[PDB]
A paper describes a structure:
For 7 of the 20 compounds, it was possible to obtain crystal structures of the complexes bound to N-HSP90 with loop-in and helical (8, 14, 16, 18, and 20) conformations of the α3-helix region (loop- and helix-binders, respectively). The main difference between the structures is the conformation of residues 104–111, which can adopt either helical or loop-in conformations. All ligands occupy the ADP-binding site and form typical interactions, which include hydrogen bonds of the 2-hydroxyl group of the resorcinol ring with the side chain of D93 and with a water molecule that generally mediates interactions with G97. The 4-hydroxyl group of the resorcinol ring forms a hydrogen bond with S52 through another ordered water molecule. Similarly, compounds 2–5 were assigned as loop-in binders based on the similarity in size of their R1 substituent to compounds 1 and 6, for which crystal structures were determined. Interestingly, there is a strong difference in the binding thermodynamics of loop-in and helix-binding compounds. Specifically, “loop-in” binding compounds are primarily enthalpically driven, with favorable or small entropic contributions. The majority of the helix-binders (7–20) have lower association and dissociation rate constants for binding to WT N-HSP90 than the loop-binders (1–6), suggesting different binding mechanisms.
Here we report the investigation of the role of protein flexibility in the modulation of binding kinetics and equilibrium thermodynamics of drug binding to heat shock protein 90 (HSP90). HSP90 is one of the most abundant proteins in the cytoplasm of eukaryotic cells, comprising 2–5% of cytosolic protein under non-stressed conditions. It is a ubiquitous molecular chaperone intimately involved in a variety of pathways, including cell signaling, proliferation and survival, and protein folding. The N-terminal domain of HSP90 (N-HSP90) contains the nucleotide-binding site, which has been the target site for drugs interfering with ATP binding and ATPase activity. The unbound N-HSP90 has a highly flexible lid segment comprising residues 107–14137.
Author numbering:
A (entry chain A), B (entry chain A): 16 to 223
Write the structure that this text describes.
Amino acid sequence: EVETFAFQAEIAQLMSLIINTFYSNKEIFLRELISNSSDALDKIRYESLTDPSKLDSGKELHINLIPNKQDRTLTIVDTGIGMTKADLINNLGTIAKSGTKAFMEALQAGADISMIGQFGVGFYSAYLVAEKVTVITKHNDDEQYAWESSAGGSFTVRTDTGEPMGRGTKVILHLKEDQTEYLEERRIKEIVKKHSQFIGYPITLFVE
Amino acid sequence: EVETFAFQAEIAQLMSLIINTFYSNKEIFLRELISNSSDALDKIRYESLTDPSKLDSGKELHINLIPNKQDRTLTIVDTGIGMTKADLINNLGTIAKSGTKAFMEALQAGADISMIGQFGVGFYSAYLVAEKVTVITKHNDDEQYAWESSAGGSFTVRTDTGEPMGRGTKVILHLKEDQTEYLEERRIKEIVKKHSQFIGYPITLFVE
Ligand SMILES: O=c1[nH]nc(-c2ccc(O)cc2O)n1-c1ccccc1F
Ligand SMILES: O=c1[nH]nc(-c2ccc(O)cc2O)n1-c1ccccc1F
């Protein structure tokens, strides 16, 4: 059963701002999503220091970047702690209501959209480049779920039957027609080198 | 009973690097500790979104900066999630062994000590300015504890009987003799404005 939820008003406001504001420096979405993956990987690593069984769902701690020109998708996969159904519903594990308030105050006070991650709502920068985002996730304490939203004020959550992940999160960006540069190897390599050069996990850019 | 523990070798190495490297830009310690407080405050806020009773130990979410020229201490107080005894022993809730490895690799590859927070070990920047650090903490799931270290390869942990905190962490920096500028109101205000202007919680600088 596919469940449909309304975004909280503040989150719908954040998403409308991200989609409608004229702002050329879109490439920062990748750093934001890689940063979230790195934080999730730190969380499972920290839990494993006192309970090695936390890694029975997979010992490898990594980030993969998978472009697909046929499907027009860029997928960011991590083997981090994952998210429970409750975390997905609760703005993908963020304090997004308060984060949005601070971000919008900062934008009016002299800040730009690239600073979104300082407000803990960097995930939503995916909507700078994606028309639809699908998040497939598996936490050790829950089942595999798929969250999805094309903005418009709602998101869906369903159980994900296909391809079991073990543990982690996959963010599938269904790119806007005019944002296909983010599927080009040279462009992705450039962004990873510019903004994600000090991430403590291997980032593998898959080839097509 | 006061328990004495050895730092893991990598953490003792990190602390020796911080204490012995010639590096003038010491003021970044404050941003690092305020950043950790902000992360702890986000964690309790996130837990409270699904369980309001998480805030029975205190509803106020804030950061206080308390200089004391008589004791030569600068104390950073937060009402964040706090740390259990296990978190304190486990490098104050960090993945410090892996964080240190990445930080030292980066330093050799063209990075400086101000970038410590990108490696998740920013707490240890306290030793840029402090000869001794005492951390008093209270998590909802444990008792109030005091961690302490003057470096030298060990730290202690004890129960803290005095002044119950409710919930949070207090980092007491026992400043080095030549670092008393960090007790001056104008100097602290300057650092907070330069590096911590987008923190989503009130930061109150106490007066003497
Ligand atoms: O805790 C977990 N588990 N999985 C995630 C996760 C979220 C978004 C994302 O693009 C990638 C991720 O791996 N997070 C997380 C990370 C950062 C902030 C809040 C969070 F919930
Ligand atoms: O989770 C909690 N609870 N309390 C803390 C805490 C640690 C240091 C600090 O200067 C202030 C804090 O409030 N943290 C935390 C924050 C950042 C990284 C790892 C952590 F454990």
